[PDB]
Ligand SMILES: Cc1cc2nc3c(=O)[nH]c(=O)nc-3n(C[C@H](O)[C@H](O)[C@H](O)COP(=O)(O)O)c2cc1C
């Protein structure tokens with residue numbers, strides 16, 4: 001098996017195993033509405049076996065960055081429908097990544113309200129993008145009832161993604177955002193049904209997954225994880241146990257795939273997660289053609305997602321096939337505004 005062999009995820013046939021990683025780019029129209037510029041960008045990248053969209057918030061309280069899209073209202077649905085129709089016409093496939101940032105936010109995005117979290121524990125560091133440099137606030141710990149409200153926002157978001165014509169949804173369970181905050185012991189000190197045991201810590205992620213399953217069928221739902229707990233001030237007392245429990249429970253549900261941001265190192269727990277899960281495993285983080293092909297050949301992965309190389313190379317799959325040079329990425333325009341550093345990276349000539 002190589003990167004260029006087709007794979008099925010659930011009942012969706014992909015033409016290759018080169019996956020476009022979910023990538024926040026901050027190019028939405030005011031009101032967090034997907035636009036034609038975004039449609040152009042995704043169309044350019046439609047040769048990907050599957051596109052995982054930029055993280056897309058399921059509610060106004062789940063945003064923490066400027067100009068990132070939502071999926072909670074009809075205006076946003078209409079904007080996304082233009083994106084998915086264009087991707088499909090270009091021969092591509094796309095899942096919407098469902099997001100809630102939890103504590104990783106700032107009151108300026110929330111009309112002065114505090115970000116919400118399982119527990120009132122301030123994340124270290126400064127809010128990205130916000131200027132002047134600001135610390136994160138201490139978040140407000142959610143009431144039990146409010147957590148059910150959040151599950152409903154994910155359910156509605158999943159319904160809205162289906163109306164918008166996506167091929168599936170991926171649950172953002174990674175990178176220190178809301179679901180990951182509940183999952184890990186350092187950030188969750190709750191004593192209701194949503195904290196205080198592994199079963200309880202994983203509960204929110206699984207309730208959101210089950211809601212998505214009702215809308216989509218599990219074989220059109222994926223989950224994103226960050227098992228090294230290395231972004232946004234995370235930390236868990238037994239991550240081998242935590243993430244394999246999640247993997248087992250997701251596998252019981254027959255979900256389409258797990259995609260983990262976890263570069264290869266001796267402490268990679270990906271193999272434990274893959275085995276517990278039993279379904280297609282998508283590795284990610286610092287992979288190149290050679291190491292991706294090596295992981296496929298060794299059975300450590302079923303597909304490989306590429307982030308930065310897809311930012312800079314719309315025709316990444318053709319470039320990989322040809323062992324062609326790759327465009328250099330410009331991190332100064334990963335975020336920010338407009339077409340420069342977004343739709344102006346060239347295709348092979
Ligand atoms: C600019 C940028 C935006 C990203 N946005 C997201 C995101 O919205 N959701 C997510 O799960 N990961 C996001 N990531 C992480 C990437 O999906 C990926 O895990 C990371 O870039 C490592 O893979 P790579 O070495 O192939 O780039 C982002 C990364 C970058 C650089």
Ligand SMILES: Cc1c([N+](=O)[O-])cc([N+](=O)[O-])cc1[N+](=O)[O-]
Nearest residue numbers: 024055174175176230231232261
């Ligand atoms: C490293 C990282 C993030 N971070 O700053 O800790 C955040 C991401 N995100 O989803 O916004 C993604 C990241 N990543 O995969 O490299």
